[PDB]
Design an enzyme around this catalytic site. Structure first.
Site, PDB file in Angstrom:
ATOM      1  N   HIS A  45       0.821  -0.927  -0.425  1.00 20.30           N
ATOM      2  CA  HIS A  45      -0.533  -0.372   0.519  1.00 20.30           C
ATOM      3  C   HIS A  45       0.961   0.680   0.163  1.00 20.30           C
ATOM      4  O   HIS A  45      -0.080   2.187  -0.437  1.00 20.30           O
ATOM      5  CB  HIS A  45      -1.029   0.176   1.503  1.00 20.30           C
ATOM      6  CG  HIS A  45      -0.115   0.323   2.315  1.00 20.30           C
ATOM      7  ND1 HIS A  45      -0.414  -0.422   3.317  1.00 20.30           N
ATOM      8  CD2 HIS A  45      -0.423   1.826   2.994  1.00 20.30           C
ATOM      9  CE1 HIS A  45      -0.028   0.191   4.892  1.00 20.30           C
ATOM     10  NE2 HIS A  45      -0.081   1.011   4.623  1.00 20.30           N
ATOM     11  N   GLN A  64      18.134  16.582   9.604  1.00 23.95           N
ATOM     12  CA  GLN A  64      19.293  17.011  10.082  1.00 23.95           C
ATOM     13  C   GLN A  64      20.404  15.640   9.283  1.00 23.95           C
ATOM     14  O   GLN A  64      20.029  14.761   8.795  1.00 23.95           O
ATOM     15  CB  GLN A  64      19.401  17.109  11.327  1.00 23.95           C
ATOM     16  CG  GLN A  64      18.799  17.778  12.018  1.00 23.95           C
ATOM     17  CD  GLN A  64      19.165  18.081  13.576  1.00 23.95           C
ATOM     18  OE1 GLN A  64      17.995  18.431  14.843  1.00 23.95           O
ATOM     19  NE2 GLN A  64      20.177  17.699  14.293  1.00 23.95           N
ATOM     20  N   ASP A  93      -0.274  -7.713   1.263  1.00 23.27           N
ATOM     21  CA  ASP A  93       0.371  -6.064   1.386  1.00 23.27           C
ATOM     22  C   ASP A  93       1.986  -5.760   1.651  1.00 23.27           C
ATOM     23  O   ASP A  93       2.612  -5.848   2.703  1.00 23.27           O
ATOM     24  CB  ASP A  93      -0.055  -5.812   3.242  1.00 23.27           C
ATOM     25  CG  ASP A  93       0.080  -3.691   2.665  1.00 23.27           C
ATOM     26  OD1 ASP A  93       0.283  -3.613   2.129  1.00 23.27           O
ATOM     27  OD2 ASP A  93      -0.601  -3.185   3.695  1.00 23.27           O
ATOM     28  N   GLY A 186       3.113   6.332   9.096  1.00 24.46           N
ATOM     29  CA  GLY A 186       4.288   6.318   7.622  1.00 24.46           C
ATOM     30  C   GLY A 186       5.380   5.771   9.018  1.00 24.46           C
ATOM     31  O   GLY A 186       6.229   5.857   8.445  1.00 24.46           O
ATOM     32  N   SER A 188       4.527   2.798   7.976  1.00 25.39           N
ATOM     33  CA  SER A 188       3.428   1.587   7.428  1.00 25.39           C
ATOM     34  C   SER A 188       5.142   0.802   6.600  1.00 25.39           C
ATOM     35  O   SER A 188       6.196   2.080   5.973  1.00 25.39           O
ATOM     36  CB  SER A 188       2.515   2.005   6.443  1.00 25.39           C
ATOM     37  OG  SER A 188       1.777   1.841   7.038  1.00 25.39           O
ATOM     38  N   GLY A 189       4.963  -0.498   6.152  1.00 26.96           N
ATOM     39  CA  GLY A 189       6.177  -0.510   5.235  1.00 26.96           C
ATOM     40  C   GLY A 189       7.425  -1.183   6.104  1.00 26.96           C
ATOM     41  O   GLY A 189       7.974  -1.903   5.785  1.00 26.96           O
TER      42      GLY A 189
HETATM   43 CA    CA Z   1      19.455  12.464   7.992  1.00 27.99          CA
END
Ligand code: CA
Length: 240
Positions: A45, A64, A93, A186, A188-189
């Site tokens: 997804h 950074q 998935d 964020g 996910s995966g």
């Molecule tokens: Ca960095």
């Protein structure tokens, strides 16, 4: 990751940041696991959108200079052929990304070790989720890589009616559900790392949380079970 702590920068060297091009910049969208010098494992997804993607290895702080990053384009995307974007609960998935260059390995950049095919964790097995995802439901991405301790919840419990019911399949791993710690958007995966016989292995690919929120009691984070897909992974890498 809700309820996490900042990872040490060399704890999880297989973690990657999957980013997409956004105007003149790049935006983190998902995690992944480096599984060959030129292959990343992520969730299907995370790659449904027709975006330009790159992978960052050796990443610690999204905002950074760590002095350790390598930035590499995604050359090919192989999504599991049974994936359906409007049915995450069906499973499948998982996706493999072939990188445009082979990354260089060091204490910040290592291959993730995958379980042997068919391996299922006992209930309450020790695992960590890692990622840069939201630090609260409807919050914002982390700057620094987070980890949270998320013990497994076996299929019998996870598929019970007060947990996920029918939504969870045996091709998935559940972890957490305590109402404090969880994956979130964020993450996910990315990996679920579980300690077995003294070594961490990547047993999960983060897939979904409840539509009600990330850290919801009795809605553990749901992952694709890597050990169900070893033959698929090996077949894709062998044919590409
Ligand atoms: Ca960095």
């Amino acid at each position: 990751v809700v309820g996490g702590t900042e990872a040490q920068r060399n704890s999880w060297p297989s973690q990657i940041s999957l980013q997409y091009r956004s105007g003149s910049s790049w935006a983190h969208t998902c995690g992944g696991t480096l599984i060959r010098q030129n292959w990343v494992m992520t969730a299907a997804h995370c790659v449904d959108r027709e975006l330009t993607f790159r992978v960052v290895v050796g990443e610690h702080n999204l905002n950074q200079n760590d002095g350790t990053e390598q930035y590499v384009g995604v050359q090919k995307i192989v999504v599991h052929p049974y994936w359906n974007t409007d049915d995450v609960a069906a499973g499948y998935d998982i996706a493999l990304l072939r990188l445009a260059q082979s990354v260089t390995l060091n204490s910040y950049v290592q291959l993730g070790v995958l379980p042997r095919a068919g391996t299922i964790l006992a209930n309450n097995s020790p695992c960590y989720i890692t990622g840069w995802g939201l630090t609260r439901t409807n919050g914002q991405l982390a700057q620094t890589l987070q980890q949270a301790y998320l013990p497994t919840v076996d299929y019998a419990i996870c598929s019970s009616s007060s947990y996920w019911g029918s939504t969870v399949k045996n091709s998935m791993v559940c972890a957490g559900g305590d109402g404090v710690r969880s994956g979130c958007q964020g993450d996910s995966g990315g990996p679920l790392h579980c300690l077995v016989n003294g070594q961490y292995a990547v047993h999960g690919v983060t897939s979904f949380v409840s539509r009600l929120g990330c850290n919801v009691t009795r809605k553990p984070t749901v992952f694709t079970r890597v050990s169900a897909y070893i033959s698929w992974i090996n077949n894709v890498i062998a044919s590409n």
